[model samples]
Target: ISSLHGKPDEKYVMVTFQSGMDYWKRCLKGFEDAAESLNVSVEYRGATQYDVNEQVTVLEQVIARKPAGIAISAINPTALTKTINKAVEEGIPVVLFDSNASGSKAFSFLGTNNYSAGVTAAHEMAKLLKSEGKVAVITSPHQLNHQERTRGFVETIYQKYPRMQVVAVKNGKGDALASKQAAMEVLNDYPDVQGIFATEANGGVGMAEAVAELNKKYVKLISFDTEKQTLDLVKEGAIAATLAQGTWNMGYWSLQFLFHLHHHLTSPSRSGDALLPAYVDTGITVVTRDNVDHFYA
Candidate 1:
C-alpha cells in the first residue's frame, strides 16, 4: 500500500458529473480540500445539462486527457458502462461517487447506500405519522440512486406497516419546477396523505414547497439529500426531516481512492469492499430541525 503521506508524481484528479448543479459545489469543495491536504491537484468537469449522451461524450473526452484518476456520478448506469470500463481498462482508475453504474467495472463506489437511506426515511416517517397514514414518494426516473431509494421505501412500508399505504410514486425529473408540479398533484389526489418521502434533493425541496403552499401542517415531509434549500426548509419547519448523505465524504475519499488505484497501491475488490474502499463511511444521516443546520454547506 502507498503511504498516505506520500504524494504521487502525477497528482491530477477529475470529478466528472452529469451537470453542474448546486449540490456539486460541496462535493467539489470536499474534493479540493482532500487534494490540498494530500498536496495534490484536482479539477471538476461535467456536461452543461443532465444528458447521458453528453456525459458519455464528456467522459470520453476526459479519458483522452489521461488524468491520474477520475471520480464520477453516472448519468445512466448502463449507457455509461462501456465508456467507464474502457477507461478502467486503460489504467485510468475510475470510482463511482454519487450515482453508481452497477454494470461498470469501476474500482469502487463512494456514496450513500441509497436504498438503506430510503428505509431510514421510511422508519422515521412511520414513527412521525404514528404508523397509520397514506404517504407518497417522489423521485427522478433517470437516476438509479433515486429508483433504489423508492424501492427500499415502498418495500419497507409494504412489509412492515400494512396500514400505511404508499399511494403514489411520482417522477419529478430532478427538476425543481417539475417536482413542485408533481407534488401538487399528489397532495391534491391524496388529501389524507400524512407523509411524503422524496428521493432526491430537488424533489425533496419541491415537496416541502407544496406542503407549505397547501397549509398541510399535519402532513410530514421526509426527504433525501441535504441541499441548501432543503436544509433551510427543515429549519423553518416546512420539512419534518431529510436524509443527509455524506456528500463531502463522497467527494473527498473518491479522489483519494482513485489516487491509490491509479498508483497501483490497491486493486479492485468485491462489491461490498469496493463500495467506499477508503476513508470514512460515505453513508447517510437523518436531518431534522435539531440537526439540519449541521448539514448546511
Candidate 2:
C-alpha cells in the first residue's frame, strides 16, 4: 500500500464496472499498471452481467468496504447516480471511467470523448463512400456512450453532408448474435445502404459478420472500440475503421484521481458558471487497417 506522503499502514482503491468484458480487461491492466508504479493496491470489482441492480448492489458492497476511493463505469447513468452520490456523501471519493454519470456527484470523468468519436466515424465513413450514400447505425439501446455516439453520427450527417443520409438506426442489445441479426435485418430492409456504423464493439463486429455473409465488399463499415473481434475484422478488410477509446487511461487515471481526492490532495468546489470543475479527458483514437495491429487488446 502507498500513501501520498509516506507508506500508509494500508491502502486500496476499488475499480467497479458493469460487466467483465474484454474492455474491462484492458482497463484493469491499466489500473494495475498504475497501481504498481504508484505502489498502491488496486481492487477490481464489477457485476458479471449488465444488470443495474447488480451494479448498484456491488457499489453498495464496495462502499461498505470503505477503500481509499472508487472508480466506476456506470451501466445506467441515472440508475446508479443515487448510489454513487451516497458513496461521495460518505467521504469516499469516487470518479467515473468509461461510461459517465453526467449529473452525478463524481469528482470527474476519465474516458473517451464519445460524441466527438462518433462525429469522426461519420466523417470517415463519408470519405470512404465518397460522400454520397445511405448509412445505417447499430447500437446498444440504453448505454449513454452508444447513445452519444449515435447522436453525434446522426447530427454530423445532417449538418455537414446533406447528400449523406442515415437511413436506419437499430438496437443490437450489445450482443454479438443480436447485433449480427439486427445488421442483417437492416441490410435487407435498406439494400441501398452503402455504409454501416456500429456504436459499440459487439455491434461493430456483428455488422462486419453480416457484411461478410452478404459478400458486400463495397459497404464501408465504421465501428466503435477495438475489441479483439473488431480488430480481426479490420485486419481482414471487413471493417473499414473503429474508434478506440482510451481504455488504459480511463483505468489508470480513474484510480489516480480517486487516490488524490481520498488523500485530500484535491478538493471539490461547485463553481456556478463553470461545468465539471475537475474533469479529465482521457481521449480517444480512430483505428483503421493501417493502424489496427497497434491497438490489440
Candidate 3:
C-alpha cells in the first residue's frame, strides 16, 4: 500500500487523451483485472478536454506522485516528450499503449501494429470498392498511431491498386463533431469517393454520421476500434468494416510489464527476456456486418 511513495490512492496510473471515450472501457476493464490478478492498485487519468497540453499537465502531476509505474497512450507524436521523459527520469516505469510517443523515455509499447492494420484496412477498402475508386482518410494527424494507420492505408492503396485514389487525408481532431465536419468537407469535395477510413473510434462515428446524413451508404466506410456505436453502424450497413484492437491485451500486459520492471525481472537467453520488449503488438481483428454482432460486449 505504501510502495507508490507519494500517492496513497493507487500505485499504478494509466493516462491517455480523451479519457472519457467509450473505446477505453475494455482497456480499463483489462487494467482493473490485471491489477486484481497482481494484487495491486491502479488509477486512470487523462485529458478530458482532449488536448495535448492538458494531457501533458495531467502526466506531469501524476509523475510528481512517483507512482509504481505509469502507462500512457500518448496523444501527440512528440509533444509529450518533456513530461513523459521526466516521468522516466524520476525512475517511474512508463509504458506506452494504444498510441506511442517513440521519443519519450517509455520503456515498452504494447498495442496493435497500427500501420499493418492500416494496410489491412486498405485491402478491405479495395474489396468494398472493387479495387478502383477514390477514398479519403479521417485521422488525428499528430497522433503516432493515427499517422501510422493513415500511412499504411495510403501506401498500400498507392502501391497495390493503381485505379484507387486517396482523395484527401483530413484531421479528425478526435472529436465527433470536428470529424463530422471534416468528413463533410471531404464528401463535398469528392462526392464520388468510394471509401473512407477513419483511424480512430470517434472519428469513425463522426464520419459515419456525416456520410449517412447524405445517404451515402454505398461509400464504403472502414474505422478502427470496437465501440458500441461503431458496431451498431456496421450492423446497419452504415460502416462496412471496423478494425478491433487487442485493447484488453494492451491493458493486461502493460501492468504485467510495469510490475516486472518494478521487481527487476530481466533475463535474456534461449527463452529470450529483457527489461521489456521494444514493442508488443496486441493484434487486431477485422469486424464487419457478418461478425459485428459478436463484438457487442
Candidate 4:
C-alpha cells in the first residue's frame, strides 16, 4: 500500500474527446471510484481538440503501451474502428463507453441507452410545447450515439406528435460557436419554431447561448448531459429540460468491464472470453424546472 500510494500498477485507460469538460469529470469520478475500489490504476487520454484523426493517434499511442485494458468514447463511430481493433487484435482487452465504434473488435459497450434518452427528450419537448409546435435539432450527426439520439427524438416526435414538426436539423459540430450559429439559422428559417434539442453537452450549451443571444426565451429548449453549466441553465430556465445521462455509471461500469475482461480472459475458471453483455444501458434522467436544482453540482 505504501509503495503503491505514489503510483498504482496495471493501468486501465479510458479515452474521450473533449477530455477536459465537466461532462467528462463526472465520468472520470466514476472511473476513479471503480479504480480505487478495485485497486488498479486508471488513465484518461484523448485529444484536447475535437478531431477524430487526432484522437485515433492518441489511441494508437495508448495501445502501444499495452495497458491492462482500454475503454474509449469514440469521437467518430467509424473512423476510429481500425485503431480500436488494433488494441483488441494485440490481445489487450478493449471496451467502449459513451460513444461506440460499431465496427471495432471491442468486447462490450457501457453507456446510456442514447436512443431512449432522445425519446424522453422528445416527450419533454412535447410537454413543454403542449404537443403542437415546430422544433429543431443541433447535433453531431456522424456520432452513432448522437445519431441514435436524433433518431429517437425525430421518430417519436413524428410518430406521436403529428401537430409538431421538426423544422430543421443542424450539425453543431459539437462546438459552442458552431451550435449558436446553427441555432440562429434554424430560427431564421423557421421563425415559429417552438423548441430545439441539442444532442450533446457542448452543443447544448452552445444552443443555450444562441437562445439567449437571440432573446428567444419562449423557444423552449431541451438539451443533453448534466454538466454544472448545463444544470445551472436548466435551473435558470434557459433550458426547459436536459437529458442527464448516467455518466458516472458509464465510467464505473467501463472500468468494471475492463477489469473483468483483463483478469478473466485467460483464467482457468472462465469458460470463454464472453464474460459480459455486449451492451449495458446505464440509463438517463429528465431534469426540468421542477427538479433541476437537485441535479446541480
Candidate 5:
C-alpha cells in the first residue's frame, strides 16, 4: 500500500486559554486520540494566564513554526481575530473550538451552543426553586461564550418564569477565590436569593464553597461542566445541577478537520469557506445527583 500523507512528522497543535485548567484535559485527550488514529503528531500550547495579550503572543510564537494546522479556543472573541486571520493568510489551516473568533477566517467551530446551554441551566434552576424566587449569576462577562450564556440564562428567567427575578450578576474572573468572593458578595447583598448559577466549572465550585462556608441553607446552586470538584459538589447535593459539554468531540473533530485540511482532502466552498461545515454543535447534557456518578468516569 502507498504510504498515507498523514505522516507522523506532520504536527497539528491545540491552543487554548488558561492552559493549566483541568477542563482542557478531556479535550486534549480527544485530540491525542484522533492523532493516534490518523498517524500524525499533536502539540498543545497556550497562554499560561487568562490575558488576551499573552494568548496573542503565544499564538504569534506558534505561527512562527508553520505547523500543519492549529486548533484554538480563543479567550476573547475579537482579540484573537487579527492573529487568526494572520495565520489563515499565511496558509495555515486554523479551526476554532470551545470558544470562537467568529470574525476570523477559521475553517470551523466545534463546541457547545452556549446560549442554549444557559437556557438549559435556567430550566434546571427553575426546577430546583419550583419556578419562583430571586436568583443570581456568577460568570466571566468579558468572554464571548460566557456572555452568551449569561444572556440566555437572564433572558430565559425573565421570559419564561415571571415569578423568578434575576437579582444580581457578578464577574467571577474564572478563578475559584474570585468566584467565591463574588458569590459571597451576592449572598451578602441578597440573602434571600434562592438560587445562583455559575457559568463555568471553577465558578460553580467556588459558589458551592461560599454557600458551604456561609453555612446558609441550600441555595440550589447550578453550574457548568464536569470538573472534579463540580461533580463532587453535585454528588453531595451541594450543587443542584451542572451542564456537561461534548468537550471530547470538540477535540477529536478539530484534529480530524485540521488533518483533512492539511492533506487537501477537503476544498473551499463557493462562498470562499472550507468544504467542512461552518459550525458543529457537539452537544450538552444536564448533570445532577441522580446521574452524577456517570460523569466521574
Candidate 6:
C-alpha cells in the first residue's frame, strides 16, 4: 500500500506503566486489532515496574525512534507532560488511554470516567453493606484515575448514605504486598468495617487475601478491573463485585484517533485542545459472580 493509506512499516507504539499486568492485555488487543485494520505495525513498551522515571526514559527512547504515533497510559498524570508535549512538538501524534496526562499536548484521552466509576463502586458497596456500615478504600493514591475513584467513593458515601462512614483510606501502591499490608492495617484499625473498596485490581486481590487470612468473609470487597485473579475472587464470593473498564475501547479508539491525526484525516489545532474530543469516557461495568464468566475472554 502507498502512503495514502499508511504503510505497514509506519509503526505505532502503545506505552503504559506496569507493563506486565493482565490489565494491559485487553487494551493491547484493541490496539493490535486497530493496527491490523490500519495496515500499520504496533509495538508495546513500558516500564516493568510502577516507576515514573523508568516510564519517562521509555517514552524518551520511543520518541528517539520517531514512531508514527504514541498511545500512552500515563503513570503519573503530570510527570509525563514534558515528554508527551515533546512528542507532539516533534510531529509524533500522541493520544492518552487508560490513564491520562490531561495537562499535556496529547491529542485525546480515551478512558473510563473514573469518578463515575467510583460513584458506582460506592453505591455497590452500599448495597453490599445494606447502606449502613463502616467502609474503607484501598487504592494507588498517587495515580490520577485512582484519586478520582477515591474521591467519588468518599464523596458519594458521605453525601448519600449518612449512616455509612468512611473509616480509612490507604495507599496500596498498586502492589499486591503493599495492598495486603494496607488491607491488614485497615482491618486491624477498623475491626467493625463491613466493606472495602479497591480502586484497582491488585488492591482488590490483596484485600481479598487479607480478608481470607483473617477469616473475615463478612467484609464485602469491591474491586476495579477484570483480571483473572480478581474475577476468580468474585466468582468464589471473595470479592463481592468488580468494575470492568472499557479497556479495549481505550486501546482501539486511541489508535484510531492517532491514525487519523497522523494521516491528516482529521485537522488538529496546534494550540488549545486536541483535534479529537477532549475526553472520551470509554465506560465501565459492574461485574459480579453472576456475570464474571462473561469477562473471562
Query: What lDDT tens digits, residue by residue, belong to model 4 across residues 81-165?
Result: 8888889889988988877777889988877887898899899899989999999989997777799899999999999999999
TM-score of each: 0.80, 0.82, 0.75, 0.77, 0.80, 0.80
The TM-score measured for candidate 5 stands at: 0.80
Question: Could you list the CA RMSD of all candidates, in the order they appear?
Answer: 4.0, 3.8, 5.1, 4.6, 3.8, 4.0
Q: Which model scores highest in TM-score?
A: 2
lDDT for model 6 comes to 0.90
Model 2 per-residue lDDT tens digits across residues 1-297: 435532343355545555567778778887877777766778788887777788888888888988788888888667788988998899888888877788899888887777888898888989998889999999876977778889989999999989999999999998889999999998899988999999988888788889889887689998888778889888888888888888888888876776667666644455344433366767777798889988885
- Put down candidate 6 lDDT per residue, 98-212, tens digits, no spaces: 8877799998899899899999999999998889999999998787779999999999999999999999999999988899999999999989999999997899889999999
Deviating ranges (above 4 Å) for candidate 1: 51-61, 140-143, 171-190, 267-281
Off by over 4 Å in 2: 1-10, 51-54, 141-144, 189-192, 267-278
Candidate order by lDDT, decreasing, is: 6, 5, 3, 4, 2, 1
- Which has the higher TM-score value, candidate number 1 or candidate number 5? 1
- Which portions of model 3 show Cα errors greater than 4 Å? 1-10, 51-66, 79-82, 130-134, 139-145, 167-193, 200-203, 206-217, 268-274, 290-297
> Candidate 5 residues 173-232, lDDT tens each?
999999999999999999999999999779998899999999989599999999888899
What lDDT score belongs to each candidate, Candidate 1 first? 0.81, 0.81, 0.87, 0.85, 0.90, 0.90
Off by over 4 Å in 6: 1-9, 48-57, 140-144, 170-192, 267-274, 294-297
> lDDT, candidate 6, residue 82?
93
Question: How many residue pairs in model 6 have overlapping backbones?
Answer: 0
TM-score of 1: 0.80
Candidate 6 deviation (Cα RMSD)? 4.0
Total clashes for model 1 = 0
lDDT accuracy of residue 90 in candidate 2: 91
Model 1 C-alpha lDDT per residue in residues 103-198, reported as the tens digit of each score: 788878777777788788889999998889999999887877788899889999999989899999999988779888889999999888898889
